[PDB]
Amino acid sequence: TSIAIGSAEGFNQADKAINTAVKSGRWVMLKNVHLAPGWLMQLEKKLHSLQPHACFRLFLTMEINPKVPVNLLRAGRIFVFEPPPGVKANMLRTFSSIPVSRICKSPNERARLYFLLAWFHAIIQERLRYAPLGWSKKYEFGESDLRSACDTVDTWLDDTAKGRQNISPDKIPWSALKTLMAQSIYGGRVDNE
Amino acid sequence: MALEEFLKQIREVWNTYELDLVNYQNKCRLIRGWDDLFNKVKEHINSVSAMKLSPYYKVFEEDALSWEDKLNRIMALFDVWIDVQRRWVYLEGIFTGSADIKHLLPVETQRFQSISTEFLALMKKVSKSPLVMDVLNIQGVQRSLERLADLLGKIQKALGEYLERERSSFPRFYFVGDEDLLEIIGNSKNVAKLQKHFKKMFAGVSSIILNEDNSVVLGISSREGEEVMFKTPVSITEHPKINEWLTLVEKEMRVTLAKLLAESVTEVEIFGKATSIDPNTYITWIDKYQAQLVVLSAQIAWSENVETALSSMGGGGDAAPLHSVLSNVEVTLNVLADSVLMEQPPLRRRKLEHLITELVHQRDVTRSLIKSKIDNAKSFEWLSQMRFYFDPKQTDVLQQLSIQMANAKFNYGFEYLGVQDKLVQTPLTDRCYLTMTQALEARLGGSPFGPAGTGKTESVKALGHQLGRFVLVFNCDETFDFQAMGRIFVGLCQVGAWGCFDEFNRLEERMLSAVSQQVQCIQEALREHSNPNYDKTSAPITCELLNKQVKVSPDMAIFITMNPGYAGRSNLPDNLKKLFRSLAMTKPDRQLIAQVMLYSQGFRTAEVLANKIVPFFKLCDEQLSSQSHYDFGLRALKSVLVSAGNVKRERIQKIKREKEERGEAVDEGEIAENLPEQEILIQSVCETMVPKLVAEDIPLLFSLLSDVFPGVQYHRGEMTALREELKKVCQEMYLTYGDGEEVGGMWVEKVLQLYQITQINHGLMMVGPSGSGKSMAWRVLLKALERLEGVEGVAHIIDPKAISKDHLYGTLDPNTREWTDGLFTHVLRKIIDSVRGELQKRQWIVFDGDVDPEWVENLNSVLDDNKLLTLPNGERLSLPPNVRIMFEVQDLKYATLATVSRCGMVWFSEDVLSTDMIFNNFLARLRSIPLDESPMLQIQRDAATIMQPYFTSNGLVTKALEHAFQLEHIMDLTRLRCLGSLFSMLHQACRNVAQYNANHPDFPMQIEQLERYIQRYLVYAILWSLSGDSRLKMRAELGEYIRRITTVPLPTAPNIPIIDYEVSISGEWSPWQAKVPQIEVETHKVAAPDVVVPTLDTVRHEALLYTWLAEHKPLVLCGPPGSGKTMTLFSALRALPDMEVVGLNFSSATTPELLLKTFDHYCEYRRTPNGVVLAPVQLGKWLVLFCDEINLPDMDKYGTQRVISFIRQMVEHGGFYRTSDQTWVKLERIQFVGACNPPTDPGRKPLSHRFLRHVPVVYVDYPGPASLTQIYGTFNRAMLRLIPSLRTYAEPLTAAMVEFYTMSQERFTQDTQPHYIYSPREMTRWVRGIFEALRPLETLPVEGLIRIWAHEALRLFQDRLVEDEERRWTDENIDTVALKHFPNIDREKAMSRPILYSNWLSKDYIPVDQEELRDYVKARLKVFYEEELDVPLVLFNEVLDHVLRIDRIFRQPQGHLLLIGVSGAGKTTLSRFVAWMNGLSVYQIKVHRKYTGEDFDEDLRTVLRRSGCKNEKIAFIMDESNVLDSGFLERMNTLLANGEVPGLFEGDEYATLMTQCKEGAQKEGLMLDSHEELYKWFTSQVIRNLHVVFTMNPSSEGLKDRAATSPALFNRCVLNWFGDWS
Amino acid sequence: PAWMRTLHTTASNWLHLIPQTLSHLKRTVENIKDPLFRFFEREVKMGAKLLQDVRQDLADVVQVCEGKKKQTNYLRTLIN
């Protein structure tokens, strides 16, 4: 049960979902919890005096903000999500996130295209580290752009290869991929010539 | 006897006037023809007023008055009736047509049944006697109508659930307001009233078309007159229910559009694949079909042609038939361009423009395809382009057309859009289309972000219209919460429409996070809908919104338009950002837009003009000086292009008319070839840009225009008739008119520019420093337009910052989700409804106030081409064509670029209003308007004649003002503040001449003496108005400058400044010292609150204050605390017997609510034929709202104080707005006097220049050593008469006092601690303490007097000290001062260090030994443990001193304490002990976690009732921890400063209080019956009996914050610094 | 206070480094037709205005550090 924090009805739904899940052993996720710090303190105090089910899990997804309570930070286990350190790490994360079945489809050239996408995403994200030189500003090139690019590659490869096992590299719609990545998927966030 | 004829005419009209009655469905006879009756009443009232203006009026006065009354009553009655009737009508249609409403709401049905019976009986009575006068003479008709209106409003307010369910029945009703939906449901039988509601439900359907019977809907119509005839007409008879036949009409519209598109495509296939196109046949085809269908047919034909050509080219090496497609497109474009070069009907002209834009895009795309050598239909260079495929063989008409882009496929929605403005297809627009369709295919929203003016919202709307989708644009704000957004999403899902949310980031971050969930649910529902396995015959796709399963139409979409990096706004959460595909829009292709727009308008040199105009705009952006109101983006360019087209059309019309009236020869080609297109473009550029430019930038703009457009000249047209009308209006309004370079030329030019901007823009803004003629410019323009065009002009002046945004736009109830209108929303809705013919007038909504993004960005959709006001409850109010939104602002330092680009700008520099015109206006007003309400007029004319030489350019006053601008003043200097103060003083001089003439009736003042007096008083007023708010040195400097430059005789004294001289009524300078006697104060009134020792400064300031108050002019006194501002004001007011003063004390959290509560208490609102008037309850008196801390209230982040704006609105416009019913209320007999510390002092903010322009400021400074010595020597001489043997010590003692005070005021300043403020208030407290100590004694040596003096010095100057070194310095300096001024006395007998004084051990205030005092306190504490509190205390010397201080304070009237020290030091315990010993009842608020403002108000009410109504002394002990909110400190500030809270007792409580007060008076023996006397006695009792002890920790920043949050603690509460134990 | 004297020394040094005079530019009919003067007029205008403001503020700060004048809200903010 995924609930976005920020509304009073949101708090009611979060309380109801947690109360149901501690008995039913269900997972509850609460997003953007950093916008309700006092409610975070109340939630931590409620969580301490509780005996939930064995399989129950409560994920609280937030951004690193100085407003989160210290008690909540000490009560829970913290996982920090940030850009992967190296190009190798970024490519490993990209390959692990993408399911194996999606890459291994009917065209044998889909794996090469997915590897090219992974390398390009890693290069762009690491150039983002050096803001003055790599780009002109800190663009938000993230997992959403990678997912959109993967969906575009899948769609256009399926359109070009009508279920054929193998496709010639010359027949791959390079123009479609390049144009959609430069204008729509990755080039949307770019506001500089 | 013309008056008799007019009266006879009125009597004959009103004796034969009958209410026109028409049968209403055989139920009753409704009144018809409201407009005729209202116009007749208004014209007769105007005639009666004109009769009153006639000199003979008296002979008929009585009779005339009677008629006026009757007329007013008539209007009043029919001011209500219509509304009542209107409501009843539709309400009936809801309580009869729907048979189920009885079960849902039985109580509402019964209430309406009773109301309907009453209304029907009343209408039967009216039908019995249709005569208007007979209807007026019905007993209790007015009260019955008001009751009916209130009850009908209640039932209307109680129909929310039924309306929501009816919205659920018909989805489009989600976009219709409660009133409008109620009207639609009620008037289903009479569809004639539904024609104005279709603009909210449909994209382009302005109205529907029915037959003569009004039973079958034959077609639909748009706002420009375009019509669509249904193939199968929808009949209302077979489907009586409103939603049923509305749905049938919508479906028939879609089917008819599909069939018409099929026919149009079949017809246009002939034009395609044709080498030659006949212009006549093409124009016939264009005229035959709707604009959207024509463009769609052209697009389909071109797409099919290109597809066939690419299929042929598929062979690779084959020839290119794409050249044939390009040639055909060019031929058709040539035909269209030739067609638009000649005159065409407006609808056909717009169709031609749309076709030209489309064909230019198609030609560019085909040229790109040819250049790229594309030969395959599957090449992405062709797949990226949008393609239209028409399948006639398709059985379903709605699915015959498919629109594809890349891999995205859509079906045309076939929603009738009418004729919408079409954007040119720039490469950025193509990128927008590609990105948004890619987002839509992936079921993701679109987020085109970037700076304002880049065509994001318009591109989204153009894409939506290209797919034939209903696009609703919402201007989001922080008010759009989870529930409102969920309701909007439900409406979009059910309707199947596109929602463009402009300014999405303006929501709260939490609210954006909450909305992310609904957006995600909608997206998953759409994704599941898109699955091929899903079949439409199965269960429809639904999503959970607001805990309801709502059907999701696949056609819907969510787009958000964002302007990241601006003032206000927020940051979107990442989970919400992942739901939208973003797109950067930063550099739109202005060159292509300009070229295509000029080409489609008929310009022959479109390419050259575009290449000259776009770089020109870039040059303007990079060349002219940077200004806050400058905008040269794409909005300005688009306005210039539209104005260029309009001016070209006007020039063609002018040329045709001239040719017709000069011979007979007309040739459209000859006219087109002989046309100065460059000159037209220059004219438009000037008319659109020049008004906004500052004086220095105008030559730069003209030089740049010459550089880019050589050889062309702009000759501004001379609006002869408008200039004559302006002359007449300025003459009748005492204004100065000027043509060209004459005095007034710049102002008239600005007025003409403002008129030209009004004719172009529906949203204006007049920017310029205060005192630049903006307000008078637009008022004169409105009056001139009213006289010239004959159309009435109404102006609604709103101060946006004087009221909260909730009160300005409206609010949605969090619980019941009920929308209540604001001020601007109510005004706009009233204009749109046009109940009383508001749409036939010129309505100007003037936002006269500061502009900040938070409130002005809500008008973004209003000021765009949308012209819609979007409300969070789904309502969208269309801006009428006659409504203009104008902003009168002094600067745009805080306005975002999103606002400055949306409004036309007119810059009023301060130079357009020269000082000469202000002088001429003053002199004209003096010569025309008498001061009393004639000898007064003769005196005024003579005085104006005498003052004419000095009020001239390069005169005494002008040079004086120029020199005074170089001096330094306590506040920023403005021209009109000094000018208004001077004019007020001169009016007072005329009044003085009048009162002299009255006092000498046999010998009126002659011309010579009058001239002499006027000259002297003019110099006096110049000095006291141009330097009143300045220090003494600069007053002397201005005096010497006048002495050098003037020619009038001046006082001969060699060193006395002119500021020390007044002007006697005989016309001679006389020193002010002649009115400063050496009075002797009565002994019992020594240092009394109302005792004022007259000095030079006091008498001068009293005279100045009397001069300013006698004119009922708001004023301000500025100076250091304790200077004597309140004392001087009260002394001046004592000379004015018909003026009562009420004190309001401002704090950091002061809002207009304090002023509103004071008005509710001391004043009353009454209804008059001219509106609501707020006047004091006591007739014949003037209420003076004395504000003590006018500059303290918090200044928000946008540099505005809300209460100050409220005061400015009530001072300038003479009234305010009641937000209970949004009614303009005019103040009467209310005046504003304020007091303030210097703006440089900590916590004080500088007042706005707009506010200061109205209020003259007088600087009251600290009394000098001479003045202090004089005053307190008088006080000490009066005091020491108790003991004769000490009388000879009166002179030295005072000096000693002064000396010590001086050193303190130098040794301790605000730099060290915030409370280190020493003033003559401490000196007065010193004198009072010595007098009270000496009062009961019969004899005393000098040593005893010295001991009392030292004790008082210690108590006043050492209690507040923090550091021990400061206290040691005070001790040593007291010793040294006493020894120096009092030698030959026993030092040890008068300055033994344990100086303790107490009346515990005796009946008098005599010195006490420390040991005896300790024993007595120990015994009293032993008793105290048994009696009240069993907490043992350890007694040390500091405890004895502290309890002595606390006892000293509790023994005073209005004696409050501020105990500052570390917690646990015994402050509360000592306070309780001393209160118990003094008999005071200790009261502490029992605060807890749930404590709120209501609980504190109740506790305050209890304390005040106990202390004032029961005469019970109370020690209100309060801690800083008990302050849970700023409201607590606000109430405490008011209570401490005045002893009364104006808004604490309201409603029943007040009545109860009054009863108790009465009883209290009866217990005291006083004979009080009136409520005002009872409240005054209650306030006096509270002052005398309530002591408040406030205890707090010695924090630094906390003390500094408290010094501004509640000044009464540091002004009315005696501060004691206990500190930590030493 | 030590910080007061450090601020005094820093203000004196800044007044020493920052120049003092800057004369404006006169308008002419043919000068306006020259964009170079159109630009240099604005440049010198803004430079002179900013130099005057900065020098006045620094002189006020050093005068406070000598104790000749008191502290105002704007002056307190500038010192902070």
Ligand SMILES: Nc1ncnc2c1ncn2[C@@H]1O[C@H](COP(=O)(O)OP(=O)(O)OP(=O)(O)O)[C@@H](O)[C@H]1O
């Ligand atoms: N054409 C004119 N001739 C003479 N006096 C004028 C003229 N126009 C304005 N004034 C006077 O000059 C003053 C300017 O007032 P006005 O309301 O026009 O200024 P404003 O710029 O709108 O002010 P603010 O920003 O304070 O509202 C008024 O006293 C007005 O009577």
Ligand SMILES: Nc1ncnc2c1ncn2[C@@H]1O[C@H](COP(=O)(O)OP(=O)(O)O)[C@@H](O)[C@H]1O
């Ligand atoms: N491609 C275009 N062709 C013609 N006009 C355009 C185009 N793009 C933007 N505009 C103009 O921009 C103006 C409004 O811009 P708008 O879209 O409201 O700015 P924003 O993107 O900040 O909402 C309209 O008058 C419109 O004519």
Ligand SMILES: Nc1ncnc2c1ncn2[C@@H]1O[C@H](COP(=O)(O)OP(=O)(O)O)[C@@H](O)[C@H]1O
């Ligand atoms: N001419 C005077 N005669 C008597 N008292 C004076 C005179 N001038 C000043 N004072 C003293 O100065 C004090 C002024 O206090 P107040 O008017 O409350 O200051 P403010 O109005 O600035 O708050 C009074 O207590 C009064 O005793």
Ligand SMILES: Nc1ncnc2c1ncn2[C@@H]1O[C@H](COP(=O)(O)OP(=O)(O)O)[C@@H](O)[C@H]1O
């Ligand atoms: N002179 C004293 N001798 C003994 N106890 C004291 C003395 N002063 C304070 N106390 C202790 O402080 C407690 C009350 O604190 P209180 O005076 O309410 O704090 P504050 O001074 O912050 O108001 C009492 O319980 C008492 O024991």
Ligand SMILES: [Mg+2]
């Ligand atoms: Mg004005």
